[PDB]
Symmetry: D2
Subunit: 475 residues, 4 copies
């Protein structure tokens, strides 16, 4: 393995993605505050497959299937139906290891728009498919069957078919398994959610021979629910992988618990996606079933601790919006001064704000935003008055009160229409804004600059020019 984690040469990217060459995928024990069975002697370790450079667990099937199925100088296009993770990993490995840039992605039409934009981001050619979002591999109307049929014709087209290619689950027998066993020699239970079942079958078949005492717990999505990644128990019946020989028990977990635990994991420091909390909740449901039955101590080793390892599949960033939909507004701190998110949209440049000596030197027109009676009493000679209802002498600063910033910016935007700008002939000349303290003036310069007017504000407003330049006659 690369001890320095430094990769150079013409094959740096190849070795960087190589599971045997890179450091082993991190295995981190979760904190005690998140483990409700800690006092019972249960230790839960998270295999952060999201910490692979590809950021998803699908890089192991993708690496193994492409190495096995691709034909040199005979494969020019890769097609695959996926829920997102596999086709991203295929897109990267096809270019890094096989020099193939034509990767076509088949996804359900009901997949979220952020998930869809992420597919285009990685250079994928996406085709949407109606009907079931998770079609059976033998459904002739689903993308899995269509991708496999498009690969039989045009021999350059390759469909590795993650749903029924043995190289899928064999990748976890080759890498994911032999890492957890060495990282956790005292492992008593391995847990993984089943999408294609490749992860769980690989882990289950490996631990079937290596340390047969390890309990193998699979997690499926509850009937009628949906979690990105795994599938329901009904959708796992037709699959031909030996998952029935790779599991010792099955748990069913819903989507609300999955997103809840995923959120709890990310704030602890283990940044992982919804299916990771899905897998952890499945482990919680089984551990509580033995504790309720009093048989939890049967999984313990010579020392009373029970070492459990569960898979964390990907990062939660593409799913962040789904958390707010599935979970309530609780467990999310509301945004303070939320109204500002749509009422101060334009940029501010510190070069627009000038000292009174610098502004009056150029004098080009000068605009005064104070009240008309305050303007009559005293103002800079030669300046135009343009009052505002939201701004008087006693008005608090815009940047100290969220509402008056909402009022002043709106009134400034509504005041500087195309007719009023030409009414003062502001177009094509340097405009200087004057205020009481300069804060309203700086908000005004952010409105005018976005409209093409070369506006500038005087820091301190009329209060600064009187003290900095006492000799200038107000009149």
């Amino acid at each position: 393995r690369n001890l320095l984690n430094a990769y150079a040469g013409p094959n740096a990217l190849r070795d960087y993605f190589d599971p045997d060459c890179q450091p082993m995928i991190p295995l981190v024990e979760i904190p005690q505050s998140l483990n409700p069975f800690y006092e019972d002697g249960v230790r839960i370790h998270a295999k952060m497959m999201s910490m692979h450079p590809s950021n998803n667990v699908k890089i192991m099937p993708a690496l193994n299937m492409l190495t096995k199925e691709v034909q040199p100088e005979k494969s020019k296009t890769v097609i695959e139906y996926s829920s997102g993770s596999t086709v991203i990993s295929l897109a990267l490995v096809s270019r890094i290891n096989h020099g193939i840039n034509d990767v076509r992605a088949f996804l359900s039409n009901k997949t979220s728009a952020p998930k869809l934009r992420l597919m285009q981001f990685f250079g994928l050619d996406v085709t949407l498919f109606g009907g079931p979002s998770q079609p059976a591999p033998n459904d002739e109307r689903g993308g899995i069957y269509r991708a496999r049929m498009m690969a039989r014709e045009d021999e350059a087209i390759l469909n590795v078919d993650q749903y029924e290619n043995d190289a899928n689950w064999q990748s976890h027998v080759k890498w994911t398994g032999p890492q957890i066993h060495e990282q956790l020699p005292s492992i008593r239970l391995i847990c993984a959610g089943m999408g294609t079942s490749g992860t769980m079958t690989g882990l289950g078949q490996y631990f079937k021979t290596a340390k047969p005492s390890v309990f193998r717990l699979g997690v499926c999505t509850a009937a009628g629910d949906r979690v990105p990644g795994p599938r329901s128990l009904a959708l796992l019946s037709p699959v031909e992988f030996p998952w029935r020989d790779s599991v010792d028990a099955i748990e069913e977990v819903g989507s609300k618990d999955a997103f809840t635990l995923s959120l709890k994991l990310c704030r602890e420091g283990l940044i992982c996606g919804p299916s990771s909390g899905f897998n952890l909740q499945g482990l919680f449901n089984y551990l509580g079933r033995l504790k309720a039955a009093g048989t939890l101590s049967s999984l313990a080793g010579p020392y009373g601790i029970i070492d459990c390892a569960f898979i964390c599949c990907d990062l939660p960033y593409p799913y962040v919006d789904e958390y707010f939909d599935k979970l309530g507004d609780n467990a999310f701190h509301p945004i303070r001064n939320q109204n500002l998110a749509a009422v101060d949209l334009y940029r501010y440049d510190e070069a627009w704000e000038l000292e009174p000596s610098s502004a009056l030197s150029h004098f080009a027109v000068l605009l005064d935003l104070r009240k008309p009676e305050d303007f009559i009493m005293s103002h800079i000679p030669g300046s135009y008055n343009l009052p505002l209802q939201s701004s008087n002498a006693s008005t608090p600063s815009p940047f100290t009160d969220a509402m008056v910033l909402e009022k002043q910016w709106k009134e400034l935007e509504a005041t500087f229409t195309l007719d009023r700008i030409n009414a003062h002939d502001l177009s094509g000349k340097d405009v200087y804004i004057l205020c009481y303290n300069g804060d309203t003036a700086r908000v005004a310069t952010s409105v005018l600059r976005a409209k093409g007017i070369s506006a500038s504000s005087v820091k301190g407003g009329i209060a600064a020019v009187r003290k900095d330049l006492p000799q200038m006659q107000m009149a």
Copy 2:
């Protein structure tokens, strides 16, 4: 260092985030196809700070500043103004290392909504601030000044102040520097974009003493432009860090090139955010300036190769929408069958589709969606006819043609109104749908189930019942 990358015990998360305990942050040489100076003997290596478990470069200042500034049993709240990355890293370290769950985030009101939702995701208390999105630390109206002033009162409130705390740039002297030098002993040039300038100052001050021959290149945002992370040269004038002694040259890069190079890096396998392409473009601009001047060979070592290292700061996932706004629709493959993204929104369950023997056994009402003249000629006795304009005998399958799926699902949704459902008394009984081939029927069962009707389809439609059940009289 943890050779196995396995972390157990009560301090597993602490050691997992520890830069000295974890494996060194990966340093990967970029492919030749992305290096336009490869033939000139230039080798560019990417320091993937995004590969830290916190996924951003700000974990080094956050770790170092919190260790230095926090007071045990005296600090209960952490407040900080940031562009996003720092306050995420502060939120995690405050809980992992200091048991502080009250972290308040000050951000500009003009930061994108996905970036804002990510702040709430990590458990942050966000306050929006108007005015400049990147305020000067001495701007009394900006969040940097306000956070520092709120920390002087209520001594439990802590503001580490990344913009003027020396522990910021010192963190990269302690970790980021001593890793790149060991990972790349032949390094000739180090490159980093300057936001708080902590990364570049740390790298510049370290290489100032360790291997003084290394050229130190800083990158700033072009005037008037904006890149998430770095700042402009104008905003770096007032900062008190010794960045002017840590750089040997300055480059200015715009936002379009930043997002373009970041996109090119992600598809190569180096998944990093916009500021990473921003830093790489700065290196390209300086290398091309020496090649145009013919002085590029002055940076070469004994062997003709020039080893350059540049920082990759974070992941591009929170910025994915900004790529489509900044970059054109080119370099993005358009979504095929895009119309399906809003015209087949409801789920399909394989249990709803039944064989003809299973459906006619229950018979509860039976619905036939064929044309009325096709229904008159032959239909299942006892069934109601409900024709559709978008479906006749010659109509292609919905799942084979995107437009007819758009037509049939719409007509089905428009047909099964509340009045028509009660007109056929479909409420409270098992409804079975009949079609020509069963495809339109399965689209109909996805419309009715979402409306509360326990609908089911017959696979093969009327064509299957006649062959599977020949003895049933049609009439």
Copy 3:
């Protein structure tokens, strides 16, 4: 002097004589009933001069006739231009063609004139030009339309502007016709009342009665300062005019618009069809009589009874919408079946309703697939039990076996017509290929089937209903008969 005793006008000058106030019968004068005269017990009799009963329907025909007769130059005048509120220039257009053969009549109006009233000018063939600024400008306001109209007739020798606001022939027409008619129609007159807009009507009545029977009281009426009613004007806007109206009135009353429309509404329902300025004139008379009665000097107007005459200026038909805006829901009976006003919008033909034997014969004569279809709107289970072979079942939740006729219950017709419109979308019409075929509608009720024909016919579908529901064709259905 002699008037048409047959009210029959023939020859080439039939139109000229028909509009002549000397040829035609006198403008009718009618005593209002006691139910509208609150002072009838006090001995006052109030008579209405129905100027609206002239062939032109407005009081403005008298000055239009007199001004044009005076100002027009035959063989030389070819264009008439006048600024008015609406009634004057209509009367000018009629007279310009009838008496002078002039068709180029241009109307200068305010830009704030209501859209219904603007179309009425176009209806009578007027050339309307809108003028910004005050709708009722002073005659010397050089911005207003009164001044420019007077200058365009000065600038050109062929353009004529009679100027109703400054021409003496305006009020002189009432000294010639309206006054003498009322005097002869009511010799015992003791008070004459009229509103003042141009003041022409009141100045004429006041100047004539000043010498002819000087004992008659002359009572003008002006609109209150805040109000405005069509026709007259307020006292403020009566200051610039040069007509001797102050010498024509003995007192002036101010009346609001609500009282004007209210009383004008009460006059039409009595049989005296007249517009808002008519109730405006009568209200001024009521106010002066009431103030005089409360003070006890009501006997001062009498001779030995008090006969009062007031002017009714035009018809209310152009103003109908204004009555509902200015008056309340009271004195207006609400619509009994208001909901039906937007739920049966389409027509019926009676020929669409066919006898059962006739309809079923047409459906069977034509081919069932290509030429004609039959729609059965009953429940699906009833349709399965018995139906006409070859018909399509389109059930409606609105109709049942016990549902009464939709034309006997307003809500049933509303619900049935709504569902019929909601079910017969163009997608469903094409789904059954109803386009271009003869459609026959069978239902439980049969009256519901007629509603279906109206809905289907309005879209282009040649639909027909079977008279009587499923009951009329029970003799033709053996399956239905055997289930009894």
Copy 4:
């Protein structure tokens, strides 16, 4: 026999005698001009019976009078109910109160009756009930309103339904009045023409003239199958009625609606103000005369000239909007300044325009901060050069020193009024604290300042303008004088 020679009606029965066709002058008969008679050269004279000139304004007053006189039972009849298209039940309400003191008149109408016509029934005090189904149902259609109205009078002893569709007193009223009047008004009559809705008018004219002068041709007019005009009906819907209309007509013409409105529009502009069914009747006469003239048998109608009389049924005022929908842009003069119809919506008072010395004295008398403000609408640089001390500068791009008066250019008024409305938002009104103060407007032009006063006054701001622009106050500004 004797008619009111003074057209003056007094006493307690003034309304009764005013509506009496025997007391009042005969309904006028007027020969249409040659410009409207295409066969005038052939020796035909066409006369219009202006039934619209009755005090009720519609032909339906004759059957309403006769039916109620026959059917009403004094001291016993207290409610009148009738299904009609609109004109009949209005005439019933007037007669029910005038002749019988009955105010409970309920009108059964179709739900498809236009909203303007529905308000006209409420205007005359009718109780309107809408009926779904066919708007013109057969009298024996038990769903329609004709049948239920006839049964409600059968069910109750106090409810009366005269039933214009089946009562002989309908057509008998024209044997009594309309026929004899036309016969005496036109003794040489050789053809009588009228449309058929209830067929009462034509049956009456046809039955009377059948015995009185049997040589007169009787020509009915029906609406074409596809068209419909208010009043008459098509031949198809004339089948169920029991009136002897076939024995009353010698020929029947069919006329479309477009020709009806077109000819009716040509009759009003000639001075014969009449509605669409009147041009409908005249078009049927033109068609029969033209067909007869082309065949060469036009001389067959003559005696030794051909005198033809046709019925004019009502006034066009309720139908004005329909004319623009059915007719084209031709024969309608367009509005000259159409753009101004929505860009100067508010009024002016003339008192708002003050002389320069008067306005500046008011502004200086009151306190400048609390009581009054002055707005200067000139350019900012001109305001800086010279202005009234204490005034606020609100420049307008629309106005300049050389810009003409907005009331002399329609686009200038449009732009200036738009910007004035666009600049004087309630934010700007509060920003200058204009609320509750006397506002004085100074501008380059002064006429532009009046537009500002109209805009400001309509919102609640007590604004006034200085007569004359900056030129009228140049003598009061020393700085301006010294810059010359």
